[PDB]
Swiss-Prot record:
This is Diphosphoinositol polyphosphate phosphohydrolase 1. Substrate binds at residues 2, 10-12, 31-33, 81-83, 107, 125. Belongs to the Nudix hydrolase family. DIPP subfamily. It catalyses: diphospho-myo-inositol polyphosphate + H2O = myo-inositol polyphosphate + phosphate; 5-diphospho-1D-myo-inositol 1,2,3,4,6-pentakisphosphate + H2O = 1D-myo-inositol hexakisphosphate + phosphate + H(+); 3,5-bis(diphospho)-1D-myo-inositol 1,2,4,6-tetrakisphosphate + H2O = 3-diphospho-1D-myo-inositol 1,2,4,5,6-pentakisphosphate + phosphate + 2 H(+); [phosphate](n+1) + n H2O = (n+1) phosphate + n H(+). Mg(2+) 3 binds at residue 58. Monomer. Mg(2+) 1 binds at residues 42, 62. Mg(2+) 2 binds at residue 58. Its cofactor is Mg(2+); Mn(2+); Zn(2+). The chain holds residues 9 to 142 of 172 of the full protein. Keywords: Acetylation, Cytoplasm, Hydrolase, Magnesium, Manganese, Metal-binding, Nucleus, Zinc. Residues 9-134 form the Nudix hydrolase domain. It is an enzyme of class 3 (hydrolase).
Amino acid sequence: TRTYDGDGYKKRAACLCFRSESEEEVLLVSSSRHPDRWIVPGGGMEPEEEPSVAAVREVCEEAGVKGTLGRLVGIFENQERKHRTYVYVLIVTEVLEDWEDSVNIGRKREWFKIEDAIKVLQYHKPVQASYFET
Ligand SMILES: O=P(O)(O)O[C@@H]1[C@@H](OP(=O)(O)OP(=O)(O)O)[C@@H](OP(=O)(O)O)[C@@H](OP(=O)(O)O)[C@H](O)[C@H]1OP(=O)(O)O
Ligand SMILES: [Cl-]
Ligand SMILES: [Cl-]
Ligand SMILES: [F-]
Ligand SMILES: [Mg+2]
Ligand SMILES: [Mg+2]
Ligand SMILES: [Mg+2]
């Protein structure tokens, strides 16, 4: 079940899934609609679900990783798609082989240097590119 803020924006959460504490490489996953494109893994908060809990859950489902949850980066609106995303740091400690979306929809995942992640997100996901601005 999808959830919404008072203004009708869909509530979402995501993590910047870093390979280490140095936050130099981040994990992106393929778009479900357009598999040749990259996105930051994240998705809808469930009813009464804490955003940090939604973030870790969606990362597990879409990217097949787990780790140590870090700081809230910020809350980011996508005015065109009418959604509002809480974005957390996650330092990846486990990479699992046969994750929900791998199995279900053949979703891919790849490590990017920060500069390269920003480059591949810019065209279709400029708000997700902005996650990395600070
Ligand atoms: O699951 P939704 O329908 O609320 O939203 C997904 C939208 O889903 P969210 O991430 O906002 O929510 P869930 O991860 O909980 O499906 C997201 O889907 P996915 O999760 O499959 O990546 C979007 O795809 P993309 O960013 O991968 O191209 C998808 O277009 C978008 O579908 P829409 O209803 O906007 O047609
Ligand atoms: Cl890193
Ligand atoms: Cl977005
Ligand atoms: F989802
Ligand atoms: Mg999802
Ligand atoms: Mg999603
Ligand atoms: Mg979901």
